[PDB]
Ligand binder design. Sequence first.
Ligand SMILES: [Zn+2]
Ligand SMILES: [Zn+2]
Ligand SMILES: [Zn+2]
Lengths: 57, 115, 193, 105, 124, 57, 106, 147, 781, 69, 44
Amino acid sequence: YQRLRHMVNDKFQVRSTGPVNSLTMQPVKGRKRHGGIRVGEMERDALIGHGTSFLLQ
Amino acid sequence: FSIPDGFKKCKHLKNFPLNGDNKQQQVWLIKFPSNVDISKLKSLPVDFESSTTMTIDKHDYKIMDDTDNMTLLVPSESKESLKIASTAPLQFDKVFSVSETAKIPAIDYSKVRVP
Amino acid sequence: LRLTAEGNKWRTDILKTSVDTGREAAAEVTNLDKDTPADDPELLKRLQEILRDNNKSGILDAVTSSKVNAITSQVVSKCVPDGTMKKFPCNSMQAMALSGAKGSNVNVSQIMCLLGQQALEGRRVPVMVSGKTLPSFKPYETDAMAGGYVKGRFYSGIKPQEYYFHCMAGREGLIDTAVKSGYLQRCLTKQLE
Amino acid sequence: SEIEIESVQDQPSVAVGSFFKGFRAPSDTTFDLYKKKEKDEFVLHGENERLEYEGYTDSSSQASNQYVVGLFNPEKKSIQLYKAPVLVSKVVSKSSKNLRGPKIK
Amino acid sequence: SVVGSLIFCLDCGDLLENPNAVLGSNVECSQCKAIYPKSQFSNLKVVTTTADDAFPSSLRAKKSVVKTSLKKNELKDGATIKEKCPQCGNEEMNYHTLQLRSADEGATVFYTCTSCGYKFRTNN
Amino acid sequence: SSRHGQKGVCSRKWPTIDMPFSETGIQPDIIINPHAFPSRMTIGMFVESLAGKAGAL
Amino acid sequence: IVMTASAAIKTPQMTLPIWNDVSDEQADTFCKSISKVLLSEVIDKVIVTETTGTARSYVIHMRFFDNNEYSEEYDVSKEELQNVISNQFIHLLEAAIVKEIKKQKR
Amino acid sequence: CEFKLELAADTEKLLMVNIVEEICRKSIIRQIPHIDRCVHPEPENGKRVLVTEGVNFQAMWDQEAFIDVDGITSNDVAAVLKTYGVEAARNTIVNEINNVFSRYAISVSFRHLDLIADMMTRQGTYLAFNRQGMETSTSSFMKMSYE
Amino acid sequence: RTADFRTLERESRFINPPKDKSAFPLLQEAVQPHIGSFNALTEGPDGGLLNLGVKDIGEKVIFDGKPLNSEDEISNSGYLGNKLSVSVEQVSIAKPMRKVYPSESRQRLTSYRGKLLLKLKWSVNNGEENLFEVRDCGGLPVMLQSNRCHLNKMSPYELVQHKEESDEIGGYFIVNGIEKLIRMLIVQRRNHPMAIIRPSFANRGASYSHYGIQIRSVRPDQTSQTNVLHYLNDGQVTFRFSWRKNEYLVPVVMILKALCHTSDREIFDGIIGNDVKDSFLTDRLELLLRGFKKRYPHLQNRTQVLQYLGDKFRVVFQASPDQSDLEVGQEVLDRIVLVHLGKDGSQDKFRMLLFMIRKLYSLVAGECSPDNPDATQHQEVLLGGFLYGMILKEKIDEYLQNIIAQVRMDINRGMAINFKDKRYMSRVLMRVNENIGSKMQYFLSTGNLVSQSGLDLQQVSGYTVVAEKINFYRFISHFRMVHRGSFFAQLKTTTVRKLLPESWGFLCPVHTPDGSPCGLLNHFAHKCRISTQQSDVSRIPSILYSLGVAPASHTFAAGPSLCCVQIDGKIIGWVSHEQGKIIADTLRYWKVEGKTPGLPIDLEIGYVPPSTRGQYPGLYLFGGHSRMLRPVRYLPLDKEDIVGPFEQVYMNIAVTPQEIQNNVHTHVEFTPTNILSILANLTPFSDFNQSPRNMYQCQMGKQTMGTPGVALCHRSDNKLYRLQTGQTPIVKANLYDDYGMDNFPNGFNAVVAVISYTGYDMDDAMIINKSADERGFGYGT
Amino acid sequence: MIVPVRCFSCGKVVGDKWESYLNLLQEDELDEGTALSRLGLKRYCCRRMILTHVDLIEKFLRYNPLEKR
Amino acid sequence: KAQGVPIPGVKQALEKKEGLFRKHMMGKRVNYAARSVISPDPNI
Ligand SMILES: [Zn+2]
Ligand SMILES: [Zn+2]
Ligand SMILES: [Zn+2]
């Protein structure tokens, strides 16, 4: 057996309230910088899908 | 012209028996490798078509014969140098080419193909 | 993964008819009566005509494939499960395919019987300008193995010639996944939201 | 069928020069042969009122191949062999030796 | 030397102009002003045949010694596996193999019925 | 991963008391699920298993 | 369909439901009728004997397949072939040669 | 068919074979407009049909003795819309999208397809899900967030 | 009685690093195309590559206008003037040394730059007086374990004593502390006319067809120059080439008449052989000859053609202002048309050009099938060291251009002084950027190709990659990895990625990555070798002529109806197809036999038999650099034979000796393991695994936390992954020992049970024993 | 690196049996199998522990930044 | 619609890649969120 060099979650992160960009005032990009997880157009579409307007809000 | 350097003009040229009577005359062209000695051989075995066999001091040869531009220049006189051969331009009656052929050994299958 | 001595005998006997299949199909597409020999000079000239055309080679590949795949189906139908040494419910390899836990009878047949005809982009194995499918095979060889038909199984192993053919099939499967609904769904969702 | 040879000449006498397909010439002009001293290289040169002929031997062909020309008898069945060099001959015209300025604009 | 529709000089080897473009009764070479013709050169003709591959058709395909087209039904599906038909209940069923998605993902099976002729797609 | 392209993430570090124990008294170092092999068809690993055992003994 | 609503589909098709009173042979004959041949499809060989005279003389010989062969493969008569060559082909050939003379001199 | 062509002395050399070849494959003796080949496949679910490799309804309308003119199907949506109307094109969209899924043995509820088709035919035309079809939409913000 | 592991032998070698020849020669044979390539840059016949390269761009002349100041003569008005001729006669890297070892650079995080020596030739007033000054050319990176490097003649005891690995491979460059290697590239096979159908050719110009010929001519200094032939729908043939970064088109009948004095009938006999009755050819050739006579009626001799060519290219080739149109014309020919035959070989260039026209016409008619560029048979491998030498030649050409630029600045202002003064030369030279070392350090640090010509390559980036040492398996695979090209990665074509039978024994069928680099980032077979140079090539025409090859200069007959004999793209003669195979078979016989001195074993004998609408026939022999070569067992004599991918296509090579069929087999493989890579061979029972799982293992072994080295206490790498408890495999291929993989363990032998018990293991999840982990099982740092 | 203390699978001390194993292969000239048996390793898990040990520490030690040459 | 890399205009700012509307309105980076590798569990 061979042990592969990659950590299982090297991309393991958690953010409550971290730093934000000046222009958008939205969570800044960067795991180590206490950055935010992006909720993209497809996740927006899925939240519209469930008819779950407060989850989208 | 005069050029190139180290080249001397050919003054003496040996006689060529050219007549072209009629029981007729035949002009032959032969190709030979540098390895074989022409002055050593006093007899050349040759037959019609591509089929030929020759062996001169361990080395084996084959005389390829083909039916069918090259121009033959025959000396009329030693002082007249060289002139184009004609009867009525001239072409060779029979053209031959000596090719060195080597005998490739038969594969010893009983020794190489093993279960 | 093992077949019984009885079951393995059936496998070798059905696969013994596959040697003729290669030349039989090659003689059918070429249109030659009494089934001409594999080394026939007119047949070899006729197969060359097929080699130079993409459509003609397609007719040859589809005919030979259907015929060798019929030999594959026969092996699988006979040997699995009536020829397997260990049988269901104890044969776990067989059990997982039948239960729907993991795998299918196709995977089971590649393991215990044969890999079959290695199909590349709907056709057989690619062939060189010389008429050779590999430097090991004869130019314009009328054999199923030369076309990519693997008689070997993963339990017994694949013959070096067979293994190279399998690799071509494997790589082709991988590239299509990498190369090939994001924009199609995005266009509908923005107009239907 | 073994054919006998009467005489062999290792001295310059008769030569062969290839031009192109369909070469006639006036058939009254002369061709001056030259020699350089393992293997000897030959140079051919001719002159005419409107044309000029120039020939030479291939360096890669001379050291590797030895060409010979012979005359055959229909009754005696004997060949008289004479060594002949093959000269790659080109023909230059009156139109040649024409050129413009070394540097134009 | 005359070849087909081409007329070449015997002295230099230059291609002589067409007898219709230049002045009548006499033709001359551009390199050396050589004396020509002989009127024995004759009205030159060239027999140019068609490519044979230039006209691809169903009839030209029927003129080929090898098979160029398959019959309406004379082409049977070779691959067959014992599987229960979800349509009604049949034993004989055709199949197809191809490795879709990533190198980690499994193989997809494409089933086909013989009684009706219904295609299928299921990985496991 | 084994030398047969059978990679898997560490789901848990199972205790030896809770681990299945052999007749010999050995508990496996690594546990591979049998449902991995029917789809991958990595029979090289299967023969590697009985070869490695034979060579160890 | 969904993304481009193309009026120029790659494989445009028509499904024609045939009656019961029309047989399998009749339907196949009908398929051929809709089926259409081209001058290329009936020609076997073309021999052009270019003779330069006076005047460039071009002897164009159209060697077709046998009359019964193309009539059974394309449903085309010899009369149908005559009209196309005498009205279309020669007018199209003359226009192509004139265009090639201009392109040579341009 | 033999015919002689006489050209001027100034016309000189020309590649007649290549010129003839190109015009022969350009010359039509026959062909029904917009149709290339008509084939006879195996009867689809018991229905006796003929599959055409082209679209021209008005031409097939003349073959009433062979074809049932009230059942002549076509995959080309725009061609169906032009001759038979918006509701016919709408029915072609739901059938054609279904053919794409049924081939890969994927079942999609017709409630979805009917909605998609109704949205494409909302303007009485054949609109696609793209910048062009979207032009006729009230929300400029929806449009701005598309492209 | 077994295929055991060396335990006693291993541990003794671990303590005692050999003082003699290093163990595992296959490991050094793996980096053989890398080290060898860089070795040929200075060592070998004709002083390596650079000396030849400087000669090609040997002189640059800049003239500043001045009055001649002589007596009454029109020469004063014409004063081109006096030429401050400049030249370079020799360039040589001295060393990267006060000797300095490679290891110091790694700790120091600085480039292991070697000092360059560049001496000039300054000639003025037609070179009456010339002064040569040896000047620093700047600093350039030097490959480790190369001739320039001090470790070239080193040993394993000695390597450990110099803080390196006992069996250190090399092949890479230490640049700013980062080990970077030049990636090998798949490029068109040198000196071979290729008939290709491309729709790209049509969309460029007016009435352009798909048909065309492409030959990649290579200079002895390894720089390439591609010449393309185009068949226009008019019946015209055009010659395409590239200078600077622009394409240029010239009529083929013009480039033919410039090479040597010939008649229109000499061109006719040269292309059309005894097949004079072929109406297709009779018309096409008339279009060419009449077209040239119509367009250029004034060009009636070789000199006029050269002058017309010189007049139109005097600006682009920059050859001015004293160089005549005859000189510039010849300069164009010598630098562009079929450069593989080189200068003083215009007769050879003429013969090869006629052959390309006949091949082009055979492709249009259909007599010849198009050659596939994506296939392994019609390609070679551009080695790193050769690429390094090419860009070096480019930088020294730029260096000379800069000297002239400084003189042009000087003469266009203050005027300063004369060229005969050494003081002025020394003043110009220190005002010019001579740091070529930094320019070469940039290429090895960015992979970006900055060039005035752009070489004969399509891409401009990614020529260099970090020699990633995360584990030895990934590290050794880098030096066996070959890429088709970065340009090919951005294409919708799948034919390029397709594994082909032409790759058998050259390109590994298993070892290719998953996803985007699939079928593009290939790996060579473990027994595959790449040509570093050529020898005895000059003695082979003598052997061929003796075997019945009729000389091309006397024969005058061409076409697919007859066999064409060529040696490294040099058409030497003509023979029949029957005799063509006889020569090809008899050559191979005297090749394997150590009795013949003029015939080398590494020679490629590419015979192409005649076929019905198949490949263009001929006897295309090869001996040159970059060729793909592999060993096989030749059935008669039972001896080793070296085979290339071009000749293999028509060759019948059995896999196992039991599969040898009578009258249809000439060769047999030594071991079928010769067709796989190092990593592909290392996979246990791979002939029992499914195809994509064997492929995934190569990628897995490359990503494993194993041993990146043992000399880590003298390293300073970005990041390293080290398995603490390495173990030797019980189940292993014997080639594991042949590459001494026990020096770098990649895993551990574990008790594995195929069981569904815990419930936490399912498809992509596996269970590890707690007590095993507690005992240090699979621990890493 | 060095011989592991205890067998990964069961926990039987293996670290004291490395140098003794090489002595049984060198001086005693025994085979791999019989040597392991004399050390008291009958389970195949304990058997592979020493049998499969590489001992890269001897290769690693040859680089010493504390002593000259 | 200028020059012919220049400084981007306000039109370019609203359409940088996918655009301000797509990258920062229709989709957004969020607070009170976490990411991790999933592991199987039959006991939950
Ligand atoms: Zn003339
Ligand atoms: Zn059914
Ligand atoms: Zn233990």
